[PDB]
Design a protein around this ligand. Structure first.
Ligand code: CA
Ligand code: CA
Lengths: 531, 531
């Protein structure tokens, strides 16, 4: 089954740090509009814009106070309508986040709900009396502490799996579901091309909210992927998504490759593709990431969803440090490792996602003062694992503040922008950006990277990650040396010819009938041929 | 200087528990309108309505999100306009709370302020960088913890003397002051007759917000009654209050009787009258409140503000337990003590305030289940000192829920409403209500209780609190036996005649030339004569 979403390349935008069109230091919608030509030039075709809905912003915008309104600092609904029009003119698809497990406590529905024990919206959230001076149950919040928050307006507590300011919607209530489907369809009718569904795995709560088998106990057994969830998700799909030509992206949170077919299966699957995070975070050993464990994790998803679902491929996001600075080497092999990592995940079976700046090799930021950081998490290892590493402003040129703003950025631009920036990288044919553009060009010109089946080679090799892609008589070999030291590639399965080398991060060296060769640090090669 | 505010009797309404006109269990504005005739019948003429402004209600409505709007559960601005019209038709004055030291963090001004380090409203609040990973200074919040709250949107902290959801307004900023005066005048032009000013003693912060001489240190030395505060308060008065015929009521928080003249002095005094709280809370001894300490506390204000200011007299409010249940005896001498307490504070020099239910002798509520309580404070002694004691619904009749609502009250009615309720008390000429009505009648018919000077008698007596009121040849003696056991009144200063007894809570017994007599438990007498 051939589809645009399987064949597309997605680009993830964190609006606040992408492009500031009005000089107030905050990226906005007009900023994005100014960069649609850039997205086209790069080659991507699906644009995922992180939360832009009205929000008190207590939870990086995932605490929505109005689903039908744009966050003031990003612009107006007119700006958004204009964005879709301009994006569609260019052949681009636009998807937004769908956060429907909860709303902000400042959402008008919760404000009415919390006012009294009997108002039309009381049942829209999860209210319960406590147990003699204590919370309704022993459930802990994913955000630490009780999942219950006492409310003095009524004497009862409301459930909040996430932040205190994120009360959970009562999916048991048909009125809630219907209001949510009307909201989804409103966006779909407005013209968006799909959504990235967030935390929907918690919409179904265990039937009497009983104590779980300890101040507060991690509560996943009472609200995550609970039986009956599929009833809500299938209804969500039939009432909304199924009525349009869109794409939905989910996450395999607490979902094994086997249970993932119920979420992303092509016939009866709530979502079209899914992200998995089992590969996130890999500390280096004495001698130097654990490539074999990476091969295993990524390979089970490749083989596991083959003809059963579709993988959403990625290395970066707004909640992670930069890939070149974590998986690669930003000190000695900056460009090489960035390109290597890019070839590695980009060419697998699935739809690749490029996070803003990943295509130019943005790295972690190392501010000396804790005050230059933002995310409350850091303030409470920052240089290496911090979320801000992916939230510093996008590096467009060597201009003041990397061309991001004419004002003062809400967070400082990484000092390496004079070198790492779009303008300079597009002039350099050996830049990380140019490598990315060639990768996008390769995948578009060779559908074997889209529908070809993945097969891992040299599984036990400690440094080389090599895999093939097969579609009929069309084959390709993606070989990557994930280490800062050379490595011998040795595989008597096929003879590699230099005329078949479609892409490499190192110059194409002469070689005929090669079954072995030394790979330079972070050397990555992509061979394509036809048997 | 004779004025309506000095001659009036004020009645304090806690809107949420006064009268529910629409059956949702929450008192509202229409409820108040239905009871204006009642207020007239009782005899009061100034109506103080507690916070009714739009508020996320995180701080009992003192966290205002919109000063130009009414809290949804209380009604609409039309209801409020109608309330003023109906109140004024009846000759009643209406005052509201003025909370201008801070606003809610959900107030549109703070939402703009917190968005970026440079927006027109950034300076409207108190933002500062922290000190290497910690708060800008060591200041503690009146509400425990740091007076600073980190905000991840900018990396800076905002000052909040009160709750986290109550960021402090920057009085240093003339734009803030001007916006506040426009707001005050808007209300004054709408027709209100004055305000009860709340926490304004904190508007002036010490000039560089330095550390005070310990996790966090109580911070009163950095923001309370700080030099320069009078500059703001005098400007507030000239730009607003001085342009209308209204009354302003303040509080002597951290203000001695000597410093109080600068706040309530008649020529240059920011407020017309002031509440003092030095008398609040008096535990009983082995044998039984400390009447002498009460005599001293109340007497310094009486003599201290004589010809220098004006006292706002009271025994109850929404933050206190009921007076009969704390100062009196609600078990054996319920009615006697209620009337005694009433005569005691009511007839002093100043403007008396009657809190809703005080006039019928409402008592503390003793719910067995902590769940029937509301104020978060209780949940964190409740039967005796709880705030809810004054927030249970007003007792109008012996009807379902005391006639307060036709629905389910937001908090339960005290089980004693079948007896303690307006309907029943108005039928009973020996009820606490009837006593209150006679007290109001007495004060209106004898201006000596308004402008007459107060003088304490028998200061060293352990149980009897006796004082006189003198205006020219018109004199009165208010004598009260504050104890559940009889007491001998003995004073050779004047001979009391039974024909001069204007009011008593016990039958008028025959006596001529009495310089001594035994007073029954909680017996209170008010003699009026002309020398
Ligand atoms: Ca902007
Ligand atoms: Ca009501």
């Amino acid at each position: 089954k051939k589809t645009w979403w399987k064949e597309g390349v997605a680009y993830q935008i964190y609006p606040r740090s992408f492009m500031d069109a009005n000089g107030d230091g905050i990226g906005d919608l007009r900023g994005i509009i100014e960069k649609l030509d850039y997205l086209v030039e790069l080659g991507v075709d699906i644009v995922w814009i992180c939360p832009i809905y009205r929000s008190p912003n207590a939870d990086n915008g995932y605490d929505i106070s109005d689903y039908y309104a744009i966050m003031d600092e990003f612009g107006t609904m007119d700006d958004f309508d204009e964005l879709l029009a301009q994006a569609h003119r260019r052949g681009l698809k636009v998807i937004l986040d769908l956060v429907i497990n909860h709303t902000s406590d400042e959402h008008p529905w919760f404000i009415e709900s919390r006012s009294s024990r009997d108002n039309p919206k009381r049942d829209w959230y999860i209210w319960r009396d406590g147990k003699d001076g204590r919370e309704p149950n022993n459930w802990e919040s994913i955000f630490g502490g009780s999942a219950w928050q006492y409310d003095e307006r009524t004497g009862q507590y409301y459930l909040h799996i996430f932040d205190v300011k994120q009360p959970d919607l009562n999916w048991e209530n048909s009125e809630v579901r219907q209001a949510l489907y009307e909201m989804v369809n409103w966006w779909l009718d407005k013209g968006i091309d799909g959504f990235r569904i967030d935390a929907i795995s918690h919409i179904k709560k265990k039937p009497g909210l009983p104590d779980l088998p300890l101040k507060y106990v991690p509560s996943f057994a009472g609200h995550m992927n609970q039986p009956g969830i599929m009833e809500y998700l299938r209804e969500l799909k039939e009432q909304t998504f199924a009525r349009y030509d869109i794409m939905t992206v989910g996450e395999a949170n607490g979902v094994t490759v086997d249970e993932a077919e119920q979420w992303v299966g092509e016939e009866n699957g709530v979502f079209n593709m899914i992200f998995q995070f089992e590969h996130l975070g890999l500390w280096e050993r004495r001698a130097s990431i654990d490539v074999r464990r990476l091969k295993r994790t990524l390979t089970k998803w490749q083989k596991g969803l083959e003809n059963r679902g579709w993988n959403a491929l990625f290395l970066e996001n707004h909640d992670l440090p930069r890939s070149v600075s974590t998986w690669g080497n930003d000190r000695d092999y900056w460009a090489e490792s960035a390109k290597a990592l890019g070839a590695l995940y980009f060419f697998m079976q699935g739809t690749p996602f490029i996070y803003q700046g990943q295509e130019i090799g943005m790295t972690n930021v190392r501010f000396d003062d804790i005050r230059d950081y933002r995310d409350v998490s850091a303030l409470r290892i920052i240089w290496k694992t911090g979320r801000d590493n992916s939230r510093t402003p996008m590096q467009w040129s060597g201009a003041s503040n990397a061309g991001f703003t004419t004002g003062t950025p809400w967070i400082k631009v990484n000092e390496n922008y004079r070198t790492i920036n779009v303008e300079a990288e597009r002039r350099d044919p050996n830049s990380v950006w140019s490598f990315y553009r060639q990768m996008i060009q390769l995948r578009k010109a060779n559908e074997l990277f889209v529908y070809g089946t993945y097969d891992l080679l040299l599984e036990n090799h400690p440094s080389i990650y090599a895999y093939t892609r097969t579609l009929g008589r069309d084959r390709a070999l993606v070989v990557v040396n994930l280490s800062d030291r050379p490595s011998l590639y040795r595989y008597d399965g096929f003879r590699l010819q230099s005329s078949d080398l479609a892409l490499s991060n190192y110059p194409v060296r002469p070689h005929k009938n090669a079954t072995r060769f030394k790979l330079k640090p972070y050397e990555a090669r992509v061979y394509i041929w036809k048997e």
